[PDB]
Amino acid sequence: PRMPQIRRDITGLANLGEVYADASPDLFDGLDNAVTTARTLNEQRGNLDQA
């Protein structure tokens, strides 16, 4: 009885995979540079709190 919902789930999964695969390289480059700036923020936590 829940087979239309299964079909909806599978089609949505395919579409979401396509969208994520299209949006992933930018996300991961941003995550690399965000790792750099997050390391910078962690190294100066006391300065940030005093600020």
Binding site: M3, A14, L16, G17, P25, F28, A34, V35, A38, D49
Partner: protein, 98 residues
């Protein structure tokens, strides 16, 4: 009978299952080749997020205090932008003659 129904309904979605397999394969390949960035995030971000959660109140207080200063500063500097300019331009000659 129910197995016949279930197998027919699954077979009607073989193209969508294939497309989902291909899409998941592409996404997982991209994430697998960015596993290095994934590891860097999972090592360096959780401490930052924990610290930010620890000092959320202080950040909110800083933003609100800067906003309290800036509201009055903005109203003063916008209510006097033109009158100050006019007064300076008028006083130029008396200042030179004095």
């Amino acid at each position: 009978n129910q197995l016949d129904t279930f197998t027919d309904e699954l077979n009607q979605q073989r193209e969508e299952i294939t497309r989902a397999i291909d899409s998941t394969n592409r996404l997982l390949n991209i994430v697998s080749q960015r596993n290095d960035t994934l590891d860097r995030v999972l090592t360096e971000f959780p401490p930052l997020i924990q610290h930010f959660a620890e000092t959320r109140d202080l950040f909110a207080d800083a933003v609100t205090a800067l906003g309290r200063l800036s509201a009055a500063a903005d109203e003063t500097l916008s209510g006097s932008n033109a009158n100050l300019h006019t007064n300076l331009q008028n006083l130029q000659r008396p200042l030179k003659q004095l």
